[PDB]
Curated annotation (Swiss-Prot), chain A:
Designated name of the protein: Proteasome subunit beta type-3
Major localisation: cytoplasm
Pfam families: Proteasome
Keyword Acetylation: yes
Organism: Bos taurus
Subunit structure: The 26S proteasome consists of a 20S proteasome core and two 19S regulatory subunits. The 20S proteasome core is a barrel-shaped complex made of 28 subunits that are arranged in four stacked rings. The two outer rings are each formed by seven alpha subunits, and the two inner rings are formed by seven beta subunits. The proteolytic activity is exerted by three beta-subunits PSMB5, PSMB6 and PSMB7.
Keywords: Acetylation, Cytoplasm, Nucleus, Proteasome
Modified residues (N6-acetyllysine): 76
Modification N-acetylserine, positions: 1
A biological-process GO annotation: proteasome-mediated ubiquitin-dependent protein catabolic process
Cellular component aspect of the GO annotation: cytosol; nucleus; proteasome core complex; proteasome core complex, beta-subunit complex
Curated annotation (Swiss-Prot), chains E, I:
GO cellular component: cytosol; nucleus; proteasome core complex; proteasome core complex, beta-subunit complex; spermatoproteasome complex
Gene designation: PSMB8
Keyword presence, tRNA-binding: no
Catalytic activity: Cleavage of peptide bonds with very broad specificity
Keywords noted in UniProt: Cytoplasm, Differentiation, Hydrolase, Immunity, Nucleus, Protease, Proteasome, Threonine protease, Zymogen
GO molecular function, one term: threonine-type endopeptidase activity
Protein name: Proteasome subunit beta type-8
Role according to the record: The proteasome is a multicatalytic proteinase complex which is characterized by its ability to cleave peptides with Arg, Phe, Tyr, Leu, and Glu adjacent to the leaving group at neutral or slightly basic pH. The proteasome has an ATP-dependent proteolytic activity. This subunit is involved in antigen processing to generate class I binding peptides. May participate in the generation of spliced peptides resulting from the ligation of two separate proteasomal cleavage products that are not contiguous in the parental protein. Required for adipocyte differentiation.
Keyword Nucleus assigned: yes
Curated annotation (Swiss-Prot), chain F:
Record lineage: Eukaryota, Metazoa, Chordata, Craniata, Vertebrata
Phosphotyrosine modifications at: 152
GO biological process terms on file: proteasome-mediated ubiquitin-dependent protein catabolic process
Protein name from the UniProt record: Proteasome subunit alpha type-7
Positions where N6-acetyllysine occurs in the chain: 226
Coarse class of the protein's main subcellular location: cytoplasm
Swiss-Prot record, chain G:
Name of the molecule in the record: Proteasome subunit beta type-10
Subunit structure: The 26S proteasome consists of a 20S proteasome core and two 19S regulatory subunits. The 20S proteasome core is composed of 28 subunits that are arranged in four stacked rings, resulting in a barrel-shaped structure. The two end rings are each formed by seven alpha subunits, and the two central rings are each formed by seven beta subunits. The catalytic chamber with the active sites is on the inside of the barrel. Component of the immunoproteasome, where it displaces the equivalent housekeeping subunit PSMB7.
Task of the protein: The proteasome is a multicatalytic proteinase complex which is characterized by its ability to cleave peptides with Arg, Phe, Tyr, Leu, and Glu adjacent to the leaving group at neutral or slightly basic pH. The proteasome has an ATP-dependent proteolytic activity. This subunit is involved in antigen processing to generate class I binding peptides.
Protein family (similarity comment): Belongs to the peptidase T1B family.
Record key words, sorted: Acetylation, Cytoplasm, Hydrolase, Nucleus, Phosphoprotein, Protease, Proteasome, Threonine protease, Zymogen
Active site: 1 (nucleophile)
GO CC, alphabetical: cytosol; nucleus; proteasome core complex; proteasome core complex, beta-subunit complex; spermatoproteasome complex
Catalytic activity as recorded in UniProt: Cleavage of peptide bonds with very broad specificity
Localisation per UniProt entry: Cytoplasm; Nucleus
């Protein structure tokens, strides 16, 4: 349908004290590819990121309306946003459009600013927030991204085991998607620091 | 549709100036933030025995963890009640969480601003005193009809509010338990109030880890024993 | 609808002036002292605190200082009521800029955008004007570090150094003397502002609580805005104390 | 009007080991949102060395299997021998084409051992195109099964790691857990598991429990 | 799907991708699209996979019945015409098949094309598939009939690798087959991505 | 909403509102412009104090188009609304007509806004008067001034602000066929017109010039002192 | 999606499952359903997930001030009229299927709200895709004013049948007891499915990932 | 279908467009100018529906001229593309949808040359080279082979002609004359109009 | 319907047929398709007749309001752009109008075209109507900007007469209007058939 125009994939897995999010770099129109540098992950502020997929028109449009509400929320508050608070914000933005709804599946991942706690969540076209204790993925290949993270995920994983798990889940699942590929950007959100890496992937 | 509030030759607002003078002569109200809780003790005076005390209550909760008292006009307060409660509603609609006291007082004080500009309407005649509990830290705020909201550890409002502030300035300090916060709030209330003090004359309520709750006349009588 | 209740705020004076606008600046003239200084290595904005009481909380950040966006910041002198709407509108305007142009707003665009709103209310609508004067600081890709000043009439202009509120003319007189254009840096401007703040303030015993200081500078390609902690301000008090006496 | 086809769900897996070939599928038969029964084995044994899976519209899965079994006897009576795994695959290709105008709606997966004793996995499509591969999948969860077998079985996208040919002990545990993970996220998979392992000695069936949801 | 063939001094070179996908999911990456008809005769595939596998084997059936009959080693021209006539009777029934026939005969290394509607063409350079237009660009640039054996491999290699990069339905490993007088021979099989790393550096 | 009649008639027919609006125009800073042969020169005094105020935001010389510039004297707040709305409509004209905007075609729109907003319900009359100067087709210059009452008129030389009548007295007497004959005479005449209103003036005087199809150019202060250097 | 409730002598219990699915797959296994309205009044959604979510959000929000404005207990029938008027305003555009039950000054009461807006009073029912499995179980074994323990054993088996008899119903069973003395929440009261384990573990050694670019940003 | 192409050199941006404007079975205007000047160093290439091509691009033309005159300085190449996307995205859900394909070419004094790709759905992506129309399939593949960030404009123009001569061979529509211009630090420089006698 | 115009050294010449038919029946043979806007400005008609009569008079209204306003004698360029913008707001509502605007200005004898969807073009030679393609052939053959006054009449005459011969919707009498600096002038009105008898001999 319309969600299959630009394709795309977004993956977020929860570790022990840290959380990792990953999405591919590909941007294309149906059978026509465009560019390799496309970015599906935008910063929400410290230790909080959001993934986006589906029609890229709404990907870039909702990202501006989320940054519309993000900055206004951060300027009014004296404290940073919690990842659980942002989940409900995306639910209101998608529900007010209920007649005209946007086409996208936002994926929110980050750490609880309280102390170390990781938090993950994802929504749907209808704007239904959902909290899972393992991982969240979205895209046209999301049926493929399940089986990788279903078996590989563990209750507690250090940044060493977390990055190795989410990276292998991306490289294996995205290669079976025709509209997805061309590099994978992986972000590691830890308590002390934040690590960004670009994986070596096939061009196909 | 023309604004009733204009700038004086001295720059002050004339309309809000009488609004602050109106809340200065209202019912005496005091509050104290000490330790893990905040004590709210107000004055409900009835002119006759025919009056039913259970029908009308001056201390009203905004939500579970937030409560509010007032000194000023009766009718303008109920308008604040409906809009502030509806604001907490519309808050819980969007954010699906209990509202922080700082954000609650901010957008409610903005409603007080709207009638210092929009025409054909008078400003509010009520000065709100807000109590709230969020993230384990108690909140005591004070708002007036001008729209500017402040924060206080302890304060006084209503008739003879200057004395209540000076009394808490001397008597009240840090390291007071909630039990001492009630008994200190009663002592500062004995000064402003005149006459015999019963459980019906005073309406007391508190907010703590369990949320904002109003005190029953039975336990108030226990605190009337000093 | 009764035409007796209308003051007709659009009436010009026989000298061609607006009454409601002139009464607005007078209310600003009673506001506390707020100043700012444009320097080579950064911008400095400091202000006093007129509300002083032992029972005050101030668990928030600054009083009259607000943050417009990542690359900009502002101060406030005037009625705190009209300041909250302007602070909201400025943030709304600066964010509506991020919608279309998706870049940090130039400090010149955000000023003329609010001023167009201020003059619209004095032009028509029958509503009273705004009683707040605002100072603006920040950095942009074109002009760099910037310091601006706004009036409730909608008039604005660029400034290297200025002051608003109480003791404004006294601080401006000292800026015409000590301030060195294109020479003193952000570090030297910090000691200069503290000197002007202590001399122009007749209230003695300046404390870290009674005053507020905020700095905005660009370091390693990122705009760094911060408010000096009371201990850090107390350290500057210990520095100025030796300088003074 | 009349809808000639409906999606009956299910999942079929086949993996070709060095000396062995493993084929497994679930027992769940459901149309729409309702469960017909929790035991409906899709795996059908053609010969000793060949096992065919069927995933798709159930009415075509039953008829097409009976047509294949009918042509199995035509061969063996004529040629005095059983069909090889590669001969059965190329046969059904022409069988699926005979309907080219009104194609059978099914996803067929054939697996087993060839004359050399090596596993041969054959994945089909309703129009009859086929290919030989080490491991294939099919059904509603087909998108789920493929990435897991690419990393684990295929050793793909892994730098500087020892590549050991597939072992039967691991191949069993890999097929079990991919379905345990499938039964979690697949509404059409679960309730039981049947694993048919074809080796040089013979076929050995197994039963594994799964969640009833 | 990207398939291309061109003829020059040293004979025909056929290059194709390995990937065939259904919808958004890739069915198989390792699919071999090139059809083997005769030792010296080489076919291709385009469009529907089953339509090619069915009809190209009928062409291979006709070519073998011919060589068993007259022993004349049927020319590429007769093979291309018989394949087109078989698609004419069923025209309009929904059969979609593209293909290209390559081989050498007494005339030379002929190159022909057969469409789904029966279009039969002749020329120096052909390509088909969803990425055919992406193939025409690189192939035409820097091409002459006088290209040598080694220079033409670089043209055929860069043809698939750069064309499959811009197509979502084209990919896999590059399968390139040179044609000679005795018969066609397998040259190289190499992943597109592995060659992408050499071109970026 | 706020709907009522603001500007109303008097016993003499004069409008007290519009008249007070023109009083604010008289109290504005002195600005002047003169039509040359192929060139036009605009200038305005600046009242900057103590090197404090930046010179980038003070500029009162604005360009409506490549061939059309302007200068204003009055309330600086009302000018920013008119200049912006004039540029929106001026380029909307280039949307309707491929040919550029004649100076008379933008003047009629501008002054029309001062007509509507003066007599409109609840609105306010503008307190500004500006000189719209530019080049028509064939290179013929044009100079037009608006009025808070909404009227406009053509001028060979014109001035606005305080002492605008005094500058016109200089222009009326010293503008002849000999005047604005060449470039050197046009530059000196505009400067000499401002030399009378010089009060602690120095570098503070700002000038700009536009020549044929060339865009509006600002003459730097160093060449100002060089052209003021020759008074004999 | 299987949701059901039963009214017994001393109160009412509302059962629901924990599993939510999106059209091809299970979205969340532990996902909660029953929402909060009043201390004694609870509801549970069905049909469209976000529509049933946002509708109960507006219901809990409207009922919250009704409890704050009145200062008294809330009526269960008041909740149902709010829900259907929203469905009537949008002319059935909202696909929210809602069941509402609780105890008020009158007594234990259970209602039902169809996405088209029709409301029905009833002692017991079920909604969702697996409603027909729970209705049949509750229809046969129901008795007037059953003991609290007798109603607990029946309704848990009703949700269990609604789970085992539906593809969209799974996971644990969340039962919430509401009595005249008070309401109590029981999370994951029933777990009919034992096999929560797996037969193998997957671990990765450091250095097995083909990393190309690497950078570190301290915080 | 009209055709567009652009190439981002290290210091330069090389763009080209077809000059043919046709209706029904005939070519009415073969010299038609598809190139619109947004700013000094910023050009624009707009193709699409015959009605939406001229109308919607002239809106962008003045809207960019709005910014430059108000603030005294033009939009940057990055700022220009992002404002044009929201203009196209706002009318996407309106009753007058705009079918257009735009390439933004511009040079910046800091980030240097910038080339931006935009579809009719208002999806903005930065790319070193991009093309529109059906001819984009026959051309961009050549760029994949010969493109390097260090290429000189002398070879780029020669390679651009090699791509455009493919439009006269495989590509069906004639398109006799092409317009070519380049952007660099010295401003807009016209190049010899491609002519096929 | 056949309408054509072209510009050269001596100015524009507009030639049109007189016949407009509905279905198989000819509504009127004597219809005058050329619209008179200004003394020196000349319009045409194509497609729907009522759409032209309505909108071209609005253009004549705008041209008159301009000359009454600024007295600048509006250029052909401004007239063509205002006509195109009015067709843009109603785009998609079913309005079908073709037209061509002819006239001389300070730049020269401009020739423009306005389509139903808002297409605005500029060039030396335009034609519209159902017989436009039949006009392009004769007009292009033997045409140069240096053609004289008398030679161009023979080109415009043979343009309509030979084009209306091959069209069932084109016919009537030939109406040809030359354009000059002072204004356009009627040249000749002659039946197509009467000129057919002179060409056959």
């Amino acid at each position: 349908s319309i969600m299959s125009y630009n394709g795309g994939a977004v993956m977020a897995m929860k570790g022990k004290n840290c959380v990792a999010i990953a999405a591919d770099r590909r941007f294309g129109i149906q059978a026509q590819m465009v560019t390799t540098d496309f970015q599906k992950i935008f910063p929400m502020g410290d230790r909080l990121y959001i993934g986006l997929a589906g029609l890229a028109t709404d990907v870039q449009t909702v990202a501006q309306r989320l940054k519309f509400r993000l900055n206004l929320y951060e300027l009014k508050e004296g404290r940073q946003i919690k990842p659980y608070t942002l989940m409900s914000m995306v639910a209101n933005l998608l529900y007010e459009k209920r007649f005209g709804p946007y086409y996208t599946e936002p994926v929110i991942a980050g750490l609880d600013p309280k102390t170390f706690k990781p938090f993950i969540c994802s929504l749907d076209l209808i704007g239904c927030p959902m909290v899972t204790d393992d991982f969240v993925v979205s895209g046209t290949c999301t049926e493929q991204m399940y089986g990788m993270c279903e078996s590989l995920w563990e209750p507690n994983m250090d940044p060493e085991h977390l990055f190795e798990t989410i990276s292998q889940a991306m490289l294996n699942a995205v290669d079976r998607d025709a509209v997805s590929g061309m590099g994978v950007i992986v972000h590691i959100i830890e308590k002390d620091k934040i690590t960004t890496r670009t994986l070596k992937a096939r061009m196909d | 549709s023309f604004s009733l509030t204009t700038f004086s030759p001295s720059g002050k607002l004339v309309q809000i100036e009488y609004a602050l003078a109106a809340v200065a002569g209202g019912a005496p109200s005091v509050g104290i933030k000490a330790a893990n809780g905040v004590v709210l003790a107000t004055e409900k005076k009835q002119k006759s025995i025919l009056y039913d005390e259970r029908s009308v209550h001056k201390v009203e909760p905004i939500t579970k963890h937030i409560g509010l008292v007032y000194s000023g006009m009766g009718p303008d307060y109920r308008v604040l009640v409906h809009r502030a409660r509806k604001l907490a509603q519309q808050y819980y609609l969007v954010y699906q969480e209990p509202i922080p006291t700082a954000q609650l007082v901010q957008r409610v004080a903005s409603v007080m601003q709207e009638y210092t500009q929009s025409g054909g309407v008078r400003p509010f005649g009520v000065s709100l005193l807000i109590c709230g509990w969020n993230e384990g830290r108690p909140y005591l705020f004070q708002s007036d009809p001008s729209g500017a909201y402040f924060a206080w550890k302890a304060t006084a409002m209503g008739k003879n509010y200057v004395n209540g502030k000076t009394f808490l300035e001397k008597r009240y300090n840090e390291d007071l338990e909630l039990e001492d916060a009630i008994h200190t709030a009663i002592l500062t209330l004995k000064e402003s109030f005149e006459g015999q003090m019963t459980e019906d004359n005073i309406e007391v309520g508190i907010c703590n880890e369990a949320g904002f709750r109003r005190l029953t006349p039975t336990e108030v009588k226990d605190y009337l024993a000093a | 609808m009764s035409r007796r209740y209308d003051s007709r705020t659009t009436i010009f004076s026989p000298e061609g002036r607006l009454y409601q606008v002139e009464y607005a600046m007078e209310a600003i003239g009673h506001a506390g002292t707020c100043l700012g200084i444009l320097a080579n290595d950064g911008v400095l904005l400091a202000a006093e605190r007129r509300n002083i009481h032992k029972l005050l909380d101030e668990v928030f950040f600054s009083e009259k200082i607000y943050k417009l966006n990542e690359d900009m910041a502002c101060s406030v002198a005037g009625i705190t009521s009209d300041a909250n709407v302007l602070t909201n509108e400025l943030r709304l305007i600066a964010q509506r800029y991020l919608l279309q142009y998706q870049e940090p707003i130039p400090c010149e665009q955000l000023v003329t955008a609010l001023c167009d709103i201020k003059q619209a209310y004095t032009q028509f609508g029958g509503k009273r004007p705004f009683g707040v004067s605002l100072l603006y600081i920040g950095w942009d890709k074109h002009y760099g570090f910037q310091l601006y000043q706004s009036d409730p009439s909608g008039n604005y202009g660029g400034w290297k150094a200025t002051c608003i509120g109480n003791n404004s003319a006294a601080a401006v007189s000292m800026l015409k003397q000590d301030y060195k254009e294109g020479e003193m840096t952000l570090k030297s401007a910090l000691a200069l502002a503290i000197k002007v703040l202590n001399k122009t303030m007749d209230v003695s015993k300046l404390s870290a609580e009674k005053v507020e200081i905020a700095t905005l500078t660009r370091e390693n390609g990122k705009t760094v805005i911060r408010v000096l902690k009371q201990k850090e301000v107390e350290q500057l008090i210990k520095k100025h104390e030796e300088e003074e006496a | 009007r009349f809808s000639p086809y409906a999606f009956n769900g299910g999942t079929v897996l086949a993996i070709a080991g060095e000396d062995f070939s493993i084929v497994a599928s679930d027992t769940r038969l459901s149309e729409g949102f309702s469960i017909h029964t929790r035991d409906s084995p899709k795996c059908y044994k053609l010969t000793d060395k060949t096992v065919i899976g069927c995933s798709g519209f159930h009415g075509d899965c039953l008829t097409l299997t009976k047509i294949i079994e009918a042509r199995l006897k035509m061969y063996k009576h004529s040629n005095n021998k059983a069909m090889t795994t590669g001969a059965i695959a190329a046969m059904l290709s022409t069988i699926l084409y005979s309907r080219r105008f009104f194609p059978y709606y099914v996803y067929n997966i054939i697996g087993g051992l060839d004359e050399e004793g090596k596993g041969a996995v054959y994945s089909f499509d309703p129009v009859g195109s086929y290919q030989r591969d080490s491991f294939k999948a099919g059904g509603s969860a087909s998108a789920m099964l493929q990435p897991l077998l690419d990393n684990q079985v295929g050793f793909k996208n892994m730098q500087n790691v020892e590549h050991v040919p597939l072992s039967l002990d691991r191949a069993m545990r890999l097929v079990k857990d991919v379905f345990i993970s499938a039964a979690e996220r697949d509404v059409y998979t679960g309730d039981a598991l049947k694993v048919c392992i074809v080796t040089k000695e013979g076929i050995r069936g197994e039963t594994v429990p799964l969640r009833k949801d | 799907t990207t398939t291309l063939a061109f003829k020059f001094q040293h004979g025909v070179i056929v290059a194709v991708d390995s990937r065939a996908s259904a919808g958004n999911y890739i069915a198989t990456l390792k699919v071999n699209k090139v059809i083997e008809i005769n030792p010296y005769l080489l076919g291709t595939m385009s469009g529907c996979a089953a339509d090619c596998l069915y009809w190209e084997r009928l062409l291979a059936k006709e070519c073998r019945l011919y060589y068993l009959r007259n022993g004349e080693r049927i020319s590429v021209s007769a093979a291309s015409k018989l394949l087109s006539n078989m698609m004419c009777q069923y025209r309009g029934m929904g059969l979609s098949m593209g293909s290209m026939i390559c081989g050498w005969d007494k005339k030379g290394p002929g190159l022909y094309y057969v469409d789904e509607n029966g279009t039969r063409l002749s020329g120096n350079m052909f390509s088909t598939g969803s990425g055919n237009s992406h193939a025409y660009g690189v192939m035409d640039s820097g091409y002459r009939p006088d290209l040598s054996i080694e220079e033409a491999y670089d043209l055929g290699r860069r043809a698939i690798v750069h064309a499959t990069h811009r197509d979502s339905y084209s990919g896999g490993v590059v399968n390139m087959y040179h044609m000679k007088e005795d018969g066609w021979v397998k040259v190289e099989s190499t992943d597109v991505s592995d060659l992408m790393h050499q071109y970026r550096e | 909403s706020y709907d009522r009649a603001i500007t109303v008639f008097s016993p003499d027919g004069h409008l007290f509102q519009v008249e007070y609006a023109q009083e604010a125009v008289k109290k504005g800073s002195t600005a002047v412009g003169v039509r040359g042969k192929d060139i036009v020169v605009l200038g305005v005094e600046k009242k900057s104090v103590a090197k404090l105020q930046d010179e980038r935001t003070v500029r009162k010389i604005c360009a409506l188009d490549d061939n059309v510039c302007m200068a204003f004297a009055g309330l600086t707040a009302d000018a920013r609304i008119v200049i912006n709305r004039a540029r929106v409509e001026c380029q909307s004209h280039r949307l309707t007509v491929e040919d550029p905007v004649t100076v008379e075609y933008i003047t009629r729109y501008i002054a029309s806004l001062k007509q509507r907003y003066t007599q409109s319900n609840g609105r306010r009359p503008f307190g500004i008067s500006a000189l719209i100067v530019g080049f028509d087709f064939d290179g013929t210059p044009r100079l037009y001034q608006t009025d808070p009452s909404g009227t406009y008129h053509a001028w060979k030389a014109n001035a606005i602000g305080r002492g605008a009548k005094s500058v016109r007295e200089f222009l009326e007497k010293n503008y002849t066929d000999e005047a604005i004959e060449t470039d050197d005479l046009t530059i000196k005449l505009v400067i000499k017109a401002l030399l009378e209103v010089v009060q602690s003036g120095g570098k503070n005087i700002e000038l700009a010039v536009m020549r044929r199809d060339q865009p509006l150019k600002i003459l730097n202060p160093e060449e100002i002192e060089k052209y003021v250097a020759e008074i004999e | 999606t299987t949701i059901a409730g039963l009214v017994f002598q001393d109160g009412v219990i509302l059962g629901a499952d924990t599993r939510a699915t999106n059209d091809s797959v299970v979205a969340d296994k532990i996902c909660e359903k029953i929402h909060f309205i009043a201390p004694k009044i609870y509801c549970c959604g069905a049909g469209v997930a976000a529509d049933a979510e946002m509708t109960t959000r507006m219901a809990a929000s409207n009922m919250e001030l009704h409890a704050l404005s009145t200062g008294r207990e809330c009526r269960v029938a008041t909740v149902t009229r709010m829900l259907r008027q929203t469905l009537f305003r949008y002319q059935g555009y909202v696909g929210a299927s809602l069941i509402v039950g609780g105890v008020d000054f009158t007594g234990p009461q259970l209602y039902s709200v169809h996405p088209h807006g029709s409301y029905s009073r009833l002692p017991f029912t079920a909604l969702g895709s697996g409603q027909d499995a729970a209705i049949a179980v509750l229809e046969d074994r129901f008795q007037p004013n059953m003991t609290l323990e007798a109603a607990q054993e029946l309704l848990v088996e009703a949700i269990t049948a609604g789970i085992l008899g539906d593809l969209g119903s799974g996971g644990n069973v969340d039962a919430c007891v509401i009595t005249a003395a008070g309401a109590k929440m029981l999370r994951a009261l029933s777990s009919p499915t034992k096999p929560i384990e797996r037969s193998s573990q997957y671990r990765f050694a450091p250095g097995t990932t083909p990393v190309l670019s690497q950078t570190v940003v301290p915080l | 279908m009209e055709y567009l192409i652009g190439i981002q050199g290290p210091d330069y941006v090389l763009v080209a467009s077809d000059r043919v404007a046709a209706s029904n079975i005939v070519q009415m205007k073969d010299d038609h100018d598809k190139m619109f000047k947004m700013s000094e160093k910023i050009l624009l290439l707009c193709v699409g529906e015959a009605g939406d091509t001229v109308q919607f691009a002239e809106y962008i033309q003045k809207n960019v001229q709005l910014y430059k005159m108000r603030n005294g300085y033009e939009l940057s190449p990055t700022a220009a593309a992002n404002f044009t996307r929201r203009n196209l995205a706002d009318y996407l859900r309106s009753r007058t949808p705009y079918h257009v394909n735009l390439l933004l070419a511009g040079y910046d004094e800091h980030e240097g040359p910038a080339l931006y790709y935009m579809d009719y759905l208002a999806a903005l992506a930065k790319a070193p080279f991009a093309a529109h129309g059906y001819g984009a399939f026959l051309t961009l593949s050549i760029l994949d082979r010969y493109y390097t960030p260090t290429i000189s404009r002398e070879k780029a123009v020669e390679l651009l002609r090699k791509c455009l001569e493919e439009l006269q061979k495989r590509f069906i529509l004639n398109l006799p004359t092409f317009s070519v211009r380049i952007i660099d630090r010295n401003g807009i420089h016209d190049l010899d109009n491609i002519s096929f006698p």
